Design a protein around this ligand. Structure first.
Ligand code: 3DK
Length: 250
């Protein structure tokens, strides 16, 4: 099924997080000390905003999965490290990028169930970045450690509207510039806070239009939340608005 690439052709260059690799083509190598199936899931996707599975090395040990090299690393760490001391449109492109990928999943009736900044990767760190969904461990596991801050109330049900909720929270992560959702609240506090109707305030300097996308992502009833086509449409509207784009980051 998956393209078994000879170990002879594979060489490990550098430890990234989890290796920088080459094949006799610069790739990223994920090693195993289940795992047969994250690669099988990622392999079946064909979209520009989802990391590509180059191949696998299950012949020798330790078993590899060859993946599209994302030199910019995860999105959570990027926001943190690249915090002004980067413009609003850079955030909007990142948001659009993941929204496209989510739309692709939604169209293909796949539920991610863990859409967060820590599961998104960046191609290069500088301008011309492309954010892509890099982790699918949660959706595999099914097919304290639970991501409660990204989950809607009815999650124990899971829909495409689940991913809509978590994307709203991802949206906050982006425009907060990498802050932890519900900053001073624990999983159980957030659980009861959300269940009561409580929602996160706008991140510092966040334009109203963008916060309004977060707000309707967090609608209590799933059928009232927007699909990702509408979300993109609305992100595109923000990208047209100059009052949104001209707003200076904190
Ligand atoms: C600084 N930094 C860069 C990276 C990085 C760069 N490029 C990358 N390309 C693919 C990855 C990656 C790493 N883990 N995953 C999740 C994953 C986990 C798994 F168990 C099986 C497959 C799989 F894709 C994707 C990946 C990670 C990690 N840290």
């Amino acid at each position: 099924d998956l393209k078994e690439v000879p170990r002879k052709n594979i060489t490990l260059i550098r430890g990234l997080g989890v290796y920088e690799g080459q094949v006799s083509l610069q790739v990223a190598v994920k090693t195993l000390p289940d795992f047969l199936m994250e690669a099988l899931i990622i392999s079946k996707f064909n979209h520009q905003n989802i990391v590509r599975c180059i191949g696998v090395s299950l012949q020798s040990l330790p078993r590899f999965i060859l993946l599209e090299l994302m030199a910019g690393g995860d999105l959570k760490s990027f926001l943190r490290e690249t915090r002004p001391r980067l413009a609003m449109l850079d955030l909007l492109h990142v948001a659009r990028d993941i929204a496209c990928g989510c739309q692709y999943l939604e169209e293909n009736h796949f539920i991610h169930r863990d859409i967060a900044a820590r599961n998104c990767l960046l191609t290069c760190p500088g301008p011309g970045r492309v954010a892509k969904i890099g982790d699918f461990g949660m959706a595999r596991d099914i097919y304290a450690m639970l991501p409660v801050k990204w989950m809607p109330p009815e999650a124990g049900i899971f829909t495409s509207k689940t991913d809509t909720w978590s994307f709203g929270v991802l949206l906050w992560e982006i425009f907060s510039l990498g802050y932890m959702p519900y900053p001073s609240k624990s999983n159980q506090e957030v659980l009861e806070f959300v269940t009561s109707g409580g929602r996160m305030d706008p991140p510092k300097n966040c334009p109203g239009p963008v916060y309004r996308i977060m707000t309707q992502c967090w609608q209590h009833q799933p059928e009232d939340r927007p699909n990702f086509a509408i979300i993109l449409e609305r992100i595109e509207y923000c990208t047209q608005d100059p009052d949104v784009i001209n707003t200076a980051l904190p």
